[PDB]
Amino acid sequence: EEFDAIKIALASPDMIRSWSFGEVKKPETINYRTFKPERDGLFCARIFGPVKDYECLCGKYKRLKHRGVICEKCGVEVTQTKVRRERMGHIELASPTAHIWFLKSLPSRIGLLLDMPLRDIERVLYFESYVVIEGGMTNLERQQILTEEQYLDALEEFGDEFDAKMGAEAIQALLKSMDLEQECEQLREELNETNSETKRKKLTKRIKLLEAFVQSGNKPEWMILTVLPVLPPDLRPLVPRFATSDLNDLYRRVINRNNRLKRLLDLAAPDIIVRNEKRMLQEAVDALLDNGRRGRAITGSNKRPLKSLADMIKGKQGRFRQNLLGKRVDYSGRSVITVGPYLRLHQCGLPKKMALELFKPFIYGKLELRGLATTIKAAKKMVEREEAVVWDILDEVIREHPVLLNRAPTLHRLGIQAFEPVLIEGKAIQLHPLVCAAYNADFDGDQMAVHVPLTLEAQLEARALMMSTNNILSPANGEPIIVPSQDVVLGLYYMTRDCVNAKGEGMVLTGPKEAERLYRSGLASLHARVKVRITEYEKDANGELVAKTSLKDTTVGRAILWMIVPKGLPYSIVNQALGKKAISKMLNTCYRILGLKPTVIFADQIMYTGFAYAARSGASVGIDDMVIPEKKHEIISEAEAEVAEIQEQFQSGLVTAGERYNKVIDIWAAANDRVSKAMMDNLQTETVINRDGQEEKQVSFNSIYMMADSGARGSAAQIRQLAGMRGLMAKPDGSIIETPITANFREGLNVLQYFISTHGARKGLADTALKTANSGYLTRRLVDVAQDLVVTEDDCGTHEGIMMTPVIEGGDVKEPLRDRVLGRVTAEDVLKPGTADILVPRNTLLHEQWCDLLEENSVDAVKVRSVVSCDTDFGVCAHCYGRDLARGHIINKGEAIGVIAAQSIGEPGTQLTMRTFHESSIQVKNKGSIKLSNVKSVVNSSGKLVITSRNTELKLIDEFGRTKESYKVPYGAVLAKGDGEQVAGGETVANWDPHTMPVITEVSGFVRFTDMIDGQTITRQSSLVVLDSAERTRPALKIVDAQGNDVLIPAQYFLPGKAIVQLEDGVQISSGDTLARIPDITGGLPRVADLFEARRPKEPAILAEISGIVSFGKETKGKRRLVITPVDGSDPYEEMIPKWRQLNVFEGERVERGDVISDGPEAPHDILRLRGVHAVTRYIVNEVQDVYRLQGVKINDKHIEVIVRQMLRKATIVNAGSSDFLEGEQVEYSRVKIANRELEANGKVGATYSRDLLGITKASLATESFISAASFQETTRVLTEAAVAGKRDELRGLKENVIVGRLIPAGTGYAYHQDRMRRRAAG
Amino acid sequence: RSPGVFFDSDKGKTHSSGKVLYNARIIPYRGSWLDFEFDPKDNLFVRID
Amino acid sequence: SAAVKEFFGSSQLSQFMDQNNPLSEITHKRRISALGPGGLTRERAGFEV
Amino acid sequence: MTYNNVFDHAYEMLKENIRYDDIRDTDDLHDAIHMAADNAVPHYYADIFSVMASEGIDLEFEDSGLMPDTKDVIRILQARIYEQLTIDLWEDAEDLLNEYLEEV
Amino acid sequence: MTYNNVFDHAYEMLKENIRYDDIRDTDDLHDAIHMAADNAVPHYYADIFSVMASEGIDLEFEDSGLMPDTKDVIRILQARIYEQLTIDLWEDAEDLLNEYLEEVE
Amino acid sequence: KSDDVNGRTKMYKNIVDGNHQMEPGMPESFNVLLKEIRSLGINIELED
């Protein structure tokens, strides 16, 4: 009994009429006759099963010894769970049935099909004497609504050929007679006939709903609910009290109304009272099905209903209602964190009290196999009395078994890790110290959870796929993993710190004999400037060790750690002070060279020697360790005197408020920087004890300086805050308060100074309190948008690549190229260090050798065989992701790349502090010749060359082939250096402010007539301004060449707003003159959820074509401003802009398809439809990376790029398609049909290309299936649309196989899923 | 909040792009609250209940 | 008795005492909370508060 | 003004009323939708006729019982825009009731 | 979409009706101006709302006798646009006749 | 481990006897979900 597809739709009523049973008529009370409710009452005896093992429903026949007997009183049989699909109660009731799929859901199935307005759908009940069914001599409409007197007049006037019913069953009397195959074709011909706003607004989508309903193959007469389905009490939650906030309230209400209806139909009551009973029955039935229907306000307790009949599928609208909620998993537990630093990375602990009952069936099976406990009761007597045999079995089982550990908030993929348990006295687990910071859980009372994998494959994947020895290089970050903090770095910093005046100086000695000398007596660990024996191995061949010996200058602790250092490693990583970054780069080098097992063993030995020598080192802070700077009070006094004199001149009347504010900022910054420099240069050279030189600068013996120089967690800000001043920090913005705070932790603080300190502390806690809802809600949408991803292809085969242009700014590179080389695999067009040749056979992995090969070549950017572009038309492939996990192998097919990619975005954004705290020239920092690329150079008569363009790019070949200097010059600047002039660095090449973007003119000659007026454009107290667009509101055209010449012989003359132009009329100036000088909550946000919502910018840019000549008429006209001179003139297409920024389109900025930024950032809708896919993708990735480098947390580019690819859903294809006219179509379903249009060779069958931006939230809440995209949705409105449309799921999505449960196509079982491909197709 | 007259800021936030408003509210000890709000059209409205 | 006992038994301002360290019975009778009926703009948190 | 900006201000005032009232039930959501369509109305006559001139609106309506019978044109237009805003805020607040419960 | 365009259409139609008939009398200005105001309104449904949306027209009535008795809002809006166009044409007709008399010699 | 009575009983027998096998089918909780979806107006049949 297998299953392939799941399709939910309204079935035929003939199966319900064949299953017509039950007697749910009268509400008799529950009696205590046969310890269960009796026949024809509350919980009637029709649909019951055996409440015990084998029984009848009365105390009767059908014992377990006899099968296949029809019951006497009832119609139930012997077997279970097969009769229950037939014995369900199907009784006809409430012929005015409920149509809540037209009420609760937003489309109307029965209303839009019969041309019925929504107001009539809301007013089906309280009706007035029927609707006239059509016939022979009927005059009015078949759906005409009349009153009671009008229907009585129609009844007394029509007479013959008239058959109608009383209630709302008459519509069913139409739907039993509905053999309609004509009206839907008329509606689709009316839809294809006209196209306007009266058909787009809620008529086109319901017309397409009728088109999808008529082509589904289902009959409309199957929509008739003739009977009321009654669920069996055995399948419902059994309750013999029996009614405590459950189904029984509406149950007894419906049965009571049914009894009243049947009694007044058997006793022949008049029409008004039975009409009232039928409308109360309908009010019971529709509230039994779906609550609310925009009325019947909830009163509260049991006098008002809470749980309806369809409320079992969703009782709560949160996260846990029937859609595979959080189940309490057995063989599991919850435990409290501590740390035991005496086991390896593969070994851990587990409490004795938990582990005695985590392996009960294993101990029972070993007692049955060893032949000591022959029965299960003897096994209980051996376990629950704690004899030594079950202790030995517990020791045998716990020694070799994988046990999962995780956190109850799990926002990383690193949370679930398997380890090996050890019987430890107590009842608290410990956590391994190379694991604690990866879970982001300090020792502050956090609680972990313990799980036990129970199968062969679960234990094998726990020992092979999910532990700490196979999760390296942090795929959420792409950075180094776990080097400890504050203990191991402290110990390895103390034992490797050089210092003079050692006990027994200058000894020549071998390697291990220094540990022989150090352990007894007469040797310090500092031990500076002593040459001893050291043995270093190197590798040059294919994993070959070179035996070498050397005499090297080092210390005791470094040479002891050199034995802890494995065979082949360099020596220059040892001679430093060995801080946190030094141990991190040492771990990086040993992981890069020696593999995985030697670097795991070496990190284990680093952990061992750190937590073994931290006790020998000794950390101590006290009353004398905090060094008070001797020049502190003088700096405080002179700063107070300067602030006092400056506020005296402030109240004299020479300084304004903002000037005093900025002076307070930089003067108090200079003050606490002088205090910091004073405590630094009083902290360095305190120790002067030495030998043979009697005066030497030596590192001091204070602890705070050692923890500051170690660089583990101690920064310079905390160092200047502890011994120096605390500083000046405000609550709302983190501003600098003008009140003096010159306190110190060595002295007594003032009351108001500590009050400003708790201002700052409470503001910081109010800023960090946002991290809960910011991290709990964003990752939900990020994973739900990346659900339907099955990687199933290794041969990608694409041609379009992505130009990897970095965000390089300045002399030193900020974001390098080496992180972009590794991972992804480049395309077939890359070049050698030689000129104009090829480097790859189009299948080549990229790491440090090939990274050096792609570093030594002369190229600025390469193209990458990569994502989204052409997609192989079979899944997502493998060369777009490459290698980002712990293994260096290519990520093959069947791996959930998108689920890793979604959790690797805002991993620790968390809004760390104050929402990440949210020149006047162009100074260069790198040498090289300047060549103007894409720059309209205009020769100026002053002797210089101004820049009349906005784009500036340059490639530099000085040391590396990749460029290191772009320096995008703003529009309207004066370049001090000519084209092709050598610069030496540190010199201003553009003498213009970057905040001002004027428009430099292109042609000389006579000034356009823009004559002044008093108060309109001029300001009188040359410097005579002639035009001001911002003051009047442009009335300006193209200037002449010399006197009156046209500009046709070799694009509009502009002036900025609110400026005083020094050029007057009748001056005859040359070409190239520069005009006048006059031209935080957004950046604090993570800016991730707003891009998924497809946010709208403030002002969109102006798009045009290749013909991009612009012009303007008067100030204002009858239409909107700036009637466009381009586009319209060669291709009819207009645009309307009410208000935007100033126009900057000129001859220097070339305008083509995909125009540059003119008036603010353009929305990515038109940028995706017109510019390109890869441009919008790289722009989104660069914006998110700019936000993340403003925050200070590095993320992965491939994950953000996959997220942008998931934002590319819901496109509208070209109208030259098969049943396609401006329809929102799935992009994957559109690109499946490429081969169908290629084989037929017709443009009418399929569209060419399409891509639209439409929201990632809408793409995540409306997917190909109805099981997925239903957690953060309403289940009823999705199931009604899936039942009307008749859409199946085919069981392919990841969330579908999570909710349903099969062989999931992500991971190791996808090949087993391909076994299903070997089962259905050709099997 | 004490029974009296409050003059909060209400810096636009739903209609304007940074225009300031000068409004007033009256919260009594019981009943409905009175609101004398501002307007870029410079009109005085009442939005009780 | 249907209003006084209901208010003194089930209310947001009348909860279970953390009856532990002697300081707690002082700081539970001498605390100020803005949450509850009346005088609460937003139930979860607030920036201006 | 356009239809989109007026509708954005409409459900903005609706979600501000939800954040002020802390409404969970759908039957209590509907009264907030009616009060929010009662709120956020424009007093400029040009904006009122611009809502009637923009897209996403039709001349014929479903219900005629809410249509008043008076010589005032602006009252009939305000009732029609009020009915359209109640329908549209219900259709786009059925999801917002789940979104607000899933935010906090 | 604005009132200025329909005002320019009515302006051009009134100039054409002055130029074609050559009327020099101020009392016989009835039929040409009334047919110009009747032929200036748009026949589409959305254009009536577009004229009512822009500025230059209000809700306050000058004469209550021009109000029809119907249940259609679109006919009342068409009558209001017709009333505003008659106000504009009967206020600009004297200036256009002055320009027509000063144009030729 | 968390859903089925028969499934936990079979896993208990496989852990005592030392077998460690999977399940031969449906956990019948998705059948409870389909039963709760049959509480609406739609009547669900199974497709194989």
- SS3 letters across chain B: CCCEEECCCCCCCCCCCCCCCCCEEEECCCCCCEEEECCCCCCCEECCC
A590 is in an annotated binding site: no
CB contact under 8 A, A329 and F48: no
Task: Give every CB contact of residue E76 below 8 A, 6+ residues apart in sequence.
Answer: D73, E67, E68, E70
CB of A589 within 8 A of CB of A571? no
CB of A802 within 8 A of CB of A866? yes
Question: How many C-alpha atoms does A921 have within 13 Å on its Cβ side?
Answer: 10
Task: Give every CB contact of residue A691 below 8 A, 6+ residues apart in sequence.
Answer: A500, A501, A505
Nearest alpha carbon to residue D57 among D66, D46, D48, D68: D48
B4 bridge partner residues: B27
CA distance A170 to A173: 4
Distance from CA of E25 to the nearest CA of D (A): 38
Distance from CA of D60 to the nearest CA of B (A): 30
CB contact under 8 A, D19 and C44: no
CA distance A223 to A220: 6
Nearest alpha carbon to residue A978 among A933, A934, A929, A936: A929
CB of A133 within 8 A of CB of A174? yes
Name the A residues in 1084-1123 with CB < 8 Å from any E CB. 1118-1119
CA distance D36 to D6: 12
A791 bridge partner residues: A876
Note the resolution in Å, 1 decimal.
3.8
For residue A786, the one-letter residue type is A
Question: How many C-alpha atoms does A907 have within 13 Å on its Cβ side?
Answer: 25
CA distance A1010 to A398: 92
To 10 degrees, the CA torsion angle through A1063, A1069, A1074, A1075?
A: 20
A1312 touches chain F (CB under 8 A): no
Structure token pair of residue A546: 């070179």
In this structure, the number of other CB atoms found within 10 A of the CB of residue A1180 comes to 18
Task: Give every CB contact of residue A1265 below 8 A, 6+ residues apart in sequence.
Answer: A1287, A1289, A1293, A1296
Distance from CA of E83 to the nearest CA of A (A): 21
A58 is in an annotated binding site: yes
Scanning every residue of chain A, which has its alpha carbon at the shortest distance from the alpha carbon of F27? A1301
- Sheet-wide strand order for B45-46: B4-6, B24-27, B34-37, B45-46
Domain encompassing residue E36: 1-105
Reduced to 3 states (helix: H, G, I; strand: E, B; else coil), residue C1 is coil
A1138 touches chain E (CB under 8 A): no
To 10 degrees, the CA torsion angle through A1202, A1204, A1210, A1212?
A: -120
D→A contacts (Cβ < 8 Å), by residue, are 25-28, 30-31, 55-59, 61-64, 87, 90-91, 94-95, 97-98, 101-104
CA distance A457 to F21: 9
User: What's the domain count of chain E?
Assistant: 1
CA distance A1011 to A1035: 10
Nearest alpha carbon to residue A1158 among A999, A989, A1321: A999
CB of A1029 within 8 A of CB of A1005? no
Chain C to chain D Cβ contacts (< 8 Å): 5
CA distance A947 to A935: 7
Where does A130-195 have alpha helices with state H?
A: 148-158, 169-175, 183-193
B46 bridge partner residues: B36
Query: Helix crossing, A360-370 with F5-17: angle to 10°?
Result: 40
CB contact under 8 A, F43 and A16: yes
Distance from CA of E63 to the nearest CA of D (A): 14
CB contact under 8 A, B14 and D13: yes
Structure token pair of residue A36: 């269960």
CA distance A1261 to A144: 39
Please identify which residue in the block is written with the tokens 């009728």: A210
For residue A320, the one-letter residue type is F
CA distance F22 to A10: 35
D9 touches chain B (CB under 8 A): yes
F47 touches chain A (CB under 8 A): yes
For residue A415, the one-letter residue type is G
Strands A982-983 and A928-929: antiparallel
A446 is in an annotated binding site: yes
CA distance A617 to A611: 10
A chain contacts of residue E8, beta-carbon cutoff 8 Å? 1118
F chain contacts of residue A220, beta-carbon cutoff 8 Å? none
Scanning every residue of chain E, which has its alpha carbon at the shortest distance from the alpha carbon of A197? E46
Q: Out of F15, F39, F48, whose CB is closest to A2? A: F48
Nearest alpha carbon to residue D49 among D74, D86, D75, D23: D74
Chains E and F touch (3+ CB pairs under 8 A): no
CA distance C20 to A977: 78
CA distance E89 to E78: 16
The percent of chain F in helix, strand and coil, each rounded to the nearest 5, is 45, 0, 55
Task: Give every CB contact of residue A637 below 8 A, 6+ residues apart in sequence.
Answer: none
Please identify which residue in the block is written with the tokens 């822009």: E54
Chains A and D touch (3+ CB pairs under 8 A): yes
For residue A873, the one-letter residue type is D
Q: For A1229-1293, where are the E strands, in sequence order? A: none
CA distance C19 to A508: 69
Q: What is the CATH number of the domain that holds E99?
A: 1.20.120.780
A436 is in an annotated binding site: no
Count how many residues are written for chain D: 104
A300 touches chain D (CB under 8 A): no
CA distance A1155 to A1160: 12
The helix/strand count (H/E) of chain C reads as 2, 0
Strands A423-424 and A350-351: parallel
Task: Give every CB contact of residue A202 below 8 A, 6+ residues apart in sequence.
Answer: none
CA distance A1301 to B1: 55
In this structure, the number of other CB atoms found within 10 A of the CB of residue A909 comes to 22
E chain contacts of residue D71, beta-carbon cutoff 8 Å? 67
Count how many residues are written for chain E: 105
A71 is in an annotated binding site: yes
Name the D residues in 31-70 with CB < 8 Å from any B CB. 39, 43-44
A472 backbone dihedrals φ, ψ, rounded to 5°: -130, 150
Reduced to 3 states (helix: H, G, I; strand: E, B; else coil), residue A188 is helix
Chains D and F touch (3+ CB pairs under 8 A): no
Question: How many C-alpha atoms does E92 have within 13 Å on its Cβ side?
Answer: 18
CB of E19 within 8 A of CB of E99? no
CA distance E97 to A784: 72
Core vs surface per residue A479-501: b (16+ CB within 10 A) or e = ebbbbbeebbbbbbbbbbbbbbe
Please identify which residue in the block is written with the tokens 């979604």: A902
To 10 degrees, the CA torsion angle through A660, A666, A667, A672?
A: 140
Query: Neighbouring chains of E at 3+ CB pairs within 8 Å?
Result: A, D
Reduced to 3 states (helix: H, G, I; strand: E, B; else coil), residue A865 is strand
CB of A1298 within 8 A of CB of A783? no
Q: Out of A117, A295, A773, whose CB is closest to D27? A: A295
CA distance A1162 to A700: 58
CB of A1154 within 8 A of CB of A1164? no
CB contact under 8 A, D53 and E55: no
Q: What is the CATH number of the domain that holds A647?
A: 1.10.132.30
Chains F and C touch (3+ CB pairs under 8 A): no
In this structure, the number of other CB atoms found within 10 A of the CB of residue D62 comes to 16
CB of D7 within 8 A of CB of D1? no
Solved using: cryo-EM
Structure token pair of residue A1: 């009994």
D chain contacts of residue B43, beta-carbon cutoff 8 Å? 43
CB contact under 8 A, A201 and D58: yes
Structure token pair of residue A1065: 């009329």
A228 bridge partner residues: A91
CA distance A992 to E77: 58
In this structure, the number of other CB atoms found within 10 A of the CB of residue A326 comes to 8
**Mutate which of D43, D44, D47 to test chain B, going by most B C-beta atoms within 10 A?**
D43
For residue B34, the one-letter residue type is L
Core vs surface per residue A937-952: b (16+ CB within 10 A) or e = bbebeeeebbbbbbbb
D103 touches chain C (CB under 8 A): no
CB of A284 within 8 A of CB of A251? no
Q: What angle do CA A1199, A1202, A1203 make, to 5 degrees?
A: 85
Q: Is A779 left (phi over 0), alpha (psi -120 to 50) or beta?
A: alpha
Domain encompassing residue A753: 631-764
A1275 backbone dihedrals φ, ψ, rounded to 5°: -75, -35
Structure token pair of residue A735: 């501003």
A74 is in an annotated binding site: yes
For residue C17, the one-letter residue type is M
In this structure, the number of other CB atoms found within 10 A of the CB of residue F37 comes to 20
Query: Neighbouring chains of D at 3+ CB pairs within 8 Å?
Result: A, B, C, E
A851 is in an annotated binding site: no
Distance from CA of B32 to the nearest CA of D (A): 14
For residue A558, the one-letter residue type is R
- For residue F21, count CB atoms less than 10 angstroms from its CB and return exposed for 0-12, middle for 13-18, buried for 19 or more: exposed
CA distance A671 to A720: 12
Reduced to 3 states (helix: H, G, I; strand: E, B; else coil), residue A721 is helix
Q: Got the DSSP string for E35-101? A: HHHHSSS-SSSHHHHHHHHSSS--S--S-GGG----S-HHHHHHHHHHHHHHHHHHHHHHHHHHHHH
Scanning every residue of chain E, which has its alpha carbon at the shortest distance from the alpha carbon of A1118? E4
Query: Neighbouring chains of C at 3+ CB pairs within 8 Å?
Result: D
A873 is in an annotated binding site: no
CB of D33 within 8 A of CB of D90? yes
Scanning every residue of chain A, which has its alpha carbon at the shortest distance from the alpha carbon of D34? A294
CB of A19 within 8 A of CB of A90? yes
F46 touches chain A (CB under 8 A): yes
